[PDB]
Design a protein around this ligand. Structure first.
Ligand SMILES: CCCC[C@H](NC(=O)c1[nH]c2c(c1C)C(=O)CC(C)(C)C2)C(=O)Nc1ccc(OC2CCN(C)CC2)cc1
Ligand SMILES: CCCC[C@H](NC(=O)c1[nH]c2c(c1C)C(=O)CC(C)(C)C2)C(=O)Nc1ccc(OC2CCN(C)CC2)cc1
Ligand SMILES: Nc1ncnc2c1ncn2[C@@H]1O[C@H](C[C@@H](N)CC[C@H](N)C(=O)O)[C@@H](O)[C@H]1O
Ligand SMILES: Nc1ncnc2c1ncn2[C@@H]1O[C@H](C[C@@H](N)CC[C@H](N)C(=O)O)[C@@H](O)[C@H]1O
Ligand SMILES: [Zn+2]
Ligand SMILES: [Zn+2]
Ligand SMILES: [Zn+2]
Ligand SMILES: [Zn+2]
Ligand SMILES: [Zn+2]
Ligand SMILES: [Zn+2]
Ligand SMILES: [Zn+2]
Ligand SMILES: [Zn+2]
Lengths: 266, 267
């Protein structure tokens, strides 16, 4: 069967680079049961706090490469190197923002600068659609953001389709989620892998509304061209979904196959 | 004879598509720093802007939105963009395409949201403080820049001391953009009685009608070196003419000491 190109860019020019879609496995058409958005949306009143006078910010007159940068100090157990790659309680990134004295091209601006690597939406053998790299990707490289519809945890609890639901797990305050079922970007198609090669990290950029950390994926290891991207959806997801389907990642250390679940239960 | 110094390579600190340098060949005034440069409007208290994506009117085009079937183009009042992104013209109202539209990010109805494309310079004028001039030919109808600042209420505008950077959106609920403390290059654009740019109300990523954004388009071909200016309006000058008179130098200046003398003479 020929690998068919069925969309030049599922993001319709909204990302820095196109994200084409191909299918060399079956007759499934380009997915159109959702609306592609490049940034989070709301379908009820969220009213993100964007008061510029309440942003924590730095006073750097360099490129924010020094340890004296306040924004770097606010970041929890992680930092960017000279090439914009991430090094590591879960981590938390505070990027520079419109209140900082620094320039838009300072060293603390990786996620807000968007997608740089070539990605492809493709039909997998056993998991539906998936996302793969069309280039080599060094460890620590920003891949993409988990984008979708901002909703409350109360709303998330009553929605029937949770296959694209991301829980932000807020520490202090009410808990919010990003639901990518009806509105989402390329990340909604990233599958679960028990041997993951990307990791999600909470990030603040142009607002510091603690209800709404944004979710950035970074590679956790060097990734080779053609490799499927995947992250660990987490035990909570699988405790819920396993009664409907089990993991087909096929790793030797798969944790969520029928067999693995059986072994955990014994 | 004083010669011109470059005193900042980019007052926007890399936030615009192009750098906006500042020069002074007139006096010893340093790069202005009694404000915070911002490339997009800010809030210091919430305006509760409606950003519900389901409230957006949007089009179904999969072309470049150049057809008359584009709903967004239909919603635009008494104006439209040509194939080069130039504006042609009860003031006009622009509805650009948005994230709910089915079209691509590079369609023909995205001029203002795509940002500054012309080359501008902040410079020291002889009599009007800082001003902004063209560094290139700017054809008639070309987008120049947005009037960016702090979104504030009518009431808040009333209690603020300095209104030299205050723009009334001319609305329902009444709001202003105050560029005194937070603003972009537009805060430095002076009044001209022979204006060469015009402010136009625009909607882009929201359609909260209380909060049009303000886009300047050239009203004629502008040549390199020409100072940019719009008509601030009679309201501004009714207030300000007591404190200073217009220095624009136009043969038909409406607000000079000379013009004021005549008006006070007639009445
Ligand atoms: C599709 C995205 C990947 C799975 C998702 N993972 C995460 O939310 C998550 N959150 C963090 C991570 C991850 C992976 C992290 O890694 C760290 C973090 C701090 C970013 C926090 C998840 O757990 N989703 C989910 C699905 C269903 C649920 O059931 C609820 C609501 C639906 N019905 C009604 C039953 C009740 C609950 C949750
Ligand atoms: C500096 C910017 C240029 C002057 C400014 N012009 C406009 O607002 C304006 N609005 C439109 C235009 C223009 C030029 C248009 O051309 C068309 C439009 C639809 C965009 C609507 C203006 O009129 N400002 C202003 C200043 C003082 C005022 O008095 C208030 C607040 C101060 N004290 C408290 C007294 C009360 C009021 C307003
Ligand atoms: N490791 C996995 N094993 C089996 N199914 C998976 C796995 N990871 C993801 N899936 C499937 O993909 C859904 C999660 C989606 N966010 C991923 C995109 C999905 N593959 C699609 O085609 O739309 C899950 O509900 C499963 O249907
Ligand atoms: N035509 C004019 N004649 C005299 N002064 C002007 C004129 N236009 C603008 N100004 C001055 O500029 C102020 C308006 C500002 N938005 C423009 C930038 C200002 N020139 C500055 O240096 O900051 C007015 O309050 C005046 O001080
Ligand atoms: Zn810094
Ligand atoms: Zn910085
Ligand atoms: Zn900073
Ligand atoms: Zn597995
Ligand atoms: Zn259209
Ligand atoms: Zn369009
Ligand atoms: Zn449209
Ligand atoms: Zn004049």
């Amino acid at each position: 069967r020929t690998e068919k190109i069925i969309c030049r860019d599922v993001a319709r020019g909204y990302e820095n680079v196109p994200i084409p879609c191909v299918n060399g496995v079956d007759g499934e058409p380009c997915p159109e049961d959702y609306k592609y958005i490049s940034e989070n949306c709301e379908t009820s009143t969220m009213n993100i706090d964007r008061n510029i006078t309440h942003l924590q910010h730095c006073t750097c007159v360099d490129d924010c490469s020094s340890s004296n940068c306040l924004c770097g100090q606010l970041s929890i157990r992680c930092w960017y190197d000279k090439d914009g790659r991430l090094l590591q309680e879960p981590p938390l990134i505070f990027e520079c923002n419109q209140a900082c004295s620094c320039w838009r091209n300072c060293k603390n601006r990786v996620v807000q600068s968007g997608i740089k690597v070539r990605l492809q939406l493709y039909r997998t053998a056993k998991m539906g659609w998936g996302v793969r790299a069309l280039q080599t990707i060094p460890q620590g490289t920003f891949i993409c953001e988990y984008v979708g519809e901002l909703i409350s945890d109360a709303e998330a609890d009553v929605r029937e389709d949770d296959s694209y639901l991301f829980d932000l797990d807020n520490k202090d305050g009410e808990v919010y989620c990003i639901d990518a079922r009806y509105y989402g970007n390329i990340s909604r198609f990233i599958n679960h892998l028990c041997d993951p090669n990307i990791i999600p990290v909470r990030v603040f950029m142009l607002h510091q509304d603690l209800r709404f950390p944004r979710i950035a994926f970074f590679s956790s290891r060097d990734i080779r061209t053609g490799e499927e991207l995947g992250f660990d959806y987490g035990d909570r997801f699988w405790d819920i979904k396993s009664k409907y389907f089990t993991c087909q990642c096929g790793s030797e250390k798969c944790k969520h196959s029928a067999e693995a679940i059986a072994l955990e239960q014994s």
